[PDB]
Design a protein around this ligand. Structure first.
Ligand code: CVM
Ligand code: ZN
Length: 133
């Protein structure tokens, strides 16, 4: 499979799936930014994003069978749903409460610390994605 990517928006600090890269530019600080096209979406969404900070290989869904590779301290992309918006943003696993289950569905409860505002939330596997490698 080909490398796929996600990019961090400087508007909301959330990660979004990238369809294609249109162009690049060098700020007079020497810092590299690329123009990205976002997945399944209008083209006023196009954004300049920093290459090193805001572009990375796409996050990976975790099957119930592999819920055991997610440990504490681990970095995850977490589906954060709040007062009317739902963003995918970084968080780290503070605690894991293992449940009894099988291949079909995971019922483990992961307590996550969101990186930005530092709030916390308890997520299930169905709402997180792991980092490659
Ligand atoms: O590693 C990370 C690294 O941190 C990050 O800078 C890097 O940015 C990914 C750069 C991708 C540039 C883009 C690739 C598709 C079309 C050509 C231009 O992503 C790496 C993963 O391949
Ligand atoms: Zn589990």
């Amino acid at each position: 499979a080909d490398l796929a990517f996600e990019a961090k928006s400087a508007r909301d600090y959330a990660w979004y799936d990238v369809s294609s890269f249109l162009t690049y530019r060098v700020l007079r600080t020497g810092e590299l930014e690329v123009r990205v096209r976002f997945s399944g979406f209008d083209n006023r969404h196009d954004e300049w994003v920093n290459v090193k900070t805001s572009v990375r290989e796409r996050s990976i869904p975790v099957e119930p069978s592999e819920c055991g590779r997610v440990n504490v301290g681990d970095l995850l992309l977490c589906f954060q749903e709040r007062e009317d918006q739902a963003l995918y943003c970084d968080g780290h696993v503070l605690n894991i409460k293992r449940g009894i289950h099988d291949h079909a569905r995971c019922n483990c409860v992961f307590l996550v610390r969101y990186e930005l505002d530092n709030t916390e939330e308890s997520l299930g596997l169905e709402r997180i994605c792991r980092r490659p490698e």
